[PDB]
Amino acid sequence: DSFVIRGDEVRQIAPGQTGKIADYNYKLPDDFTGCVIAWNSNNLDSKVG
């Protein structure tokens, strides 16, 4: 999967975590057997204005 979220919502992408970005947009199961990969991208996805 591939999506772009903010910094304070990266912790919500995890099995068991709940909130706003993890309950209405993208929900992970409690038995999720995988690896979450995220990194800062404040160089091409943020224009002036």
Place this chain on the structure above:
Amino acid sequence: SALGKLQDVVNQNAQALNTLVKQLSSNFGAISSVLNDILSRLDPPEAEV
């Protein structure tokens, strides 16, 4: 003092049943002994423990 053994057996069975019933009112280290209250007060990820 004649019907002693039968009375003792009946009392032992009654005490065993009463203890088995009262064991449902213990926390065993949890926050409470009410499954509904636990599920209502905590989200499933935390209430699973």
